[PDB]
C-alpha cells in the first residue's frame, strides 16, 4: 500500500518555537522506526511529473 | 513536501516473524506520532487514477 | 516522463449539451494517437493510495 | 479522473525515422486536442515527492 503524507513545517505568522513535520524529521523517524523491522536504503526523489493547469 | 511510503505486510513464504509495515501500523504510528504536534482528521483514499500498460 | 491529465466531463448546471474530456475519449484518442507509433496494451488502474486529510 | 501517461523520447536502439511519445508532442497534441473544447493555460510541474528505496 502506498501512503501519502505531506510534511513541510507549514509556515505561518507567529514565530512559533519548534517544528514537527520536517522533511528531515520524516526521514529520521520513518527510517529509525522502520529500521527496527529490517528496512534500509536511502531516500530517492520520485520521477518528475507534469500537470496541466487550467486558465482560459 | 509529499512523502511516498509503501507499507504492505507481504509474507508469501518464510519464517513466522512479524511485519511492522502494516497499513494499520502506519495510520496508528503516523497519527499518534504527528498528533503530538497538533495534527488530526482521518485517512482518506486518494483520487482514482488510470495508467496505460504497454503490451504489443 | 510522466504526464498528469484530469479528464472528467463533470456538469453542475443543467445544459450539458456535450462533452470532450471523457474517460473513454482519452483511452480512444490516446490509444489511437499513440498506436500510430507502435504502442498497445490496455488501460490498467493505478495502485491504491491513501492520503491523510487534516481536520482538528 | 486523473490519467497517467508516460511519454519519453528514449529510443536508444534503432535508427532515425520518427517519434510520437515526445514531451513536446503531448503538450501540443493534448493542448491542441483539448483546446477545441475550451481548455487553456500552461503545463505546470507537479509537486516534488520523495520515495524510499529499499536496499539492506
Swiss-Prot record, chains A, B, C, D:
Disulfide bonds: none annotated. Sequence repeats lie at residues 2-56. It is found in: Secreted, Cell wall. Binds to the constant Fc region of IgG with high affinity. This is Immunoglobulin G-binding protein G. It comes from Streptococcus sp. group G. The chain holds residues 228 to 282 of 448 of the full protein.
Amino acid at each position: 500500500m502506498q501512503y501519502k503524507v505531506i510534511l513541510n513545517g507549514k509556515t505561518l505568522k507567529g514565530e512559533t518555537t519548534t517544528e514537527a513535520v520536517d522533511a528531515a524529521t520524516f526521514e529520521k523517524v520513518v527510517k529509525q522506526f522502520f529500521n527496527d523491522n529490517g528496512v534500509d536504503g536511502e531516500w530517492t526523489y520520485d520521477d518528475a511529473t507534469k500537470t496541466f493547469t487550467v486558465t482560459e
